[PDB]
Write a protein that binds this ligand. Structure first.
Ligand SMILES: C[C@@H]1CN(c2ncnc3[nH]c4ccccc4c23)C[C@@H](CO)O1
Length: 167
């Protein structure tokens, strides 16, 4: 039993809710919140900008030190950093950004990072300002992630479409 509340069950291991991931993280304080990161960990907008703002920019400060030491992530890759006031840990995962021309096949590699964590609160990778089809992102998630994932979808219209079209 865990503390996630109000989710619709899509599969054995995938759950979904119309929610603001920032507000959901503040309430649940999950072990892991996933950030929709880019390779530079520049958290300017979308989910990343929202999560960083909620940490009062501490996420960005920590991220800048990470990049200065380690260099950029790979598209499809991830790193574990602090969750600050939102979670124990933040798993920064880089989905392909269609608006940069990145290969959508890398979306599966991105979701594979979730399998290193037993339970996660997450957004749909590559959705929103990353330009992929969220219906496709949900399908890849369900077909790739085997650990327990609680998906927060900010847009109610999109949430209803994701549920109604789910096979
Ligand atoms: C695939 C993404 C998912 N994004 C979200 N998902 C869940 N909670 C969220 N809170 C936010 C606050 C500000 C901006 C974005 C979000 C957001 C929306 C959109 C952004 O590119 O597309």
């Amino acid at each position: 039993v865990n503390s996630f509340s109000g989710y619709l069950k899509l599969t054995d291991n995938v759950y979904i809710k119309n929610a603001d991931i920032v507000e959901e993280a503040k309430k649940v304080k999950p072990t892991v919140v996933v950030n929709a990161a880019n390779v530079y960990l520049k958290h300017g907008g979308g989910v990343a900008g929202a999560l960083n703002k909620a940490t009062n920019n501490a996420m960005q400060v920590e991220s800048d030190d990470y990049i200065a030491t380690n260099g950029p992530l790979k598209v499809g890759g991830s790193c574990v950093l602090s969750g600050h006031n939102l979670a124990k840990h933040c798993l920064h995962v880089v989905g392909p950004n269609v608006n940069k021309g990145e290969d959508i096949q890398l979306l599966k590699s991105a979701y594979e990072n979730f399998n290193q964590h037993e339970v996660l609160l997450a957004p749909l990778l590559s959705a929103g300002i990353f330009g992929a089809d969220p219906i496709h992102s949900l399908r890849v998630c369900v077909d790739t992630v085997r650990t327990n994932v609680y998906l927060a979808v900010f847009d109610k219209n999109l949430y209803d479409k994701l549920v109604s079209s789910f096979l």
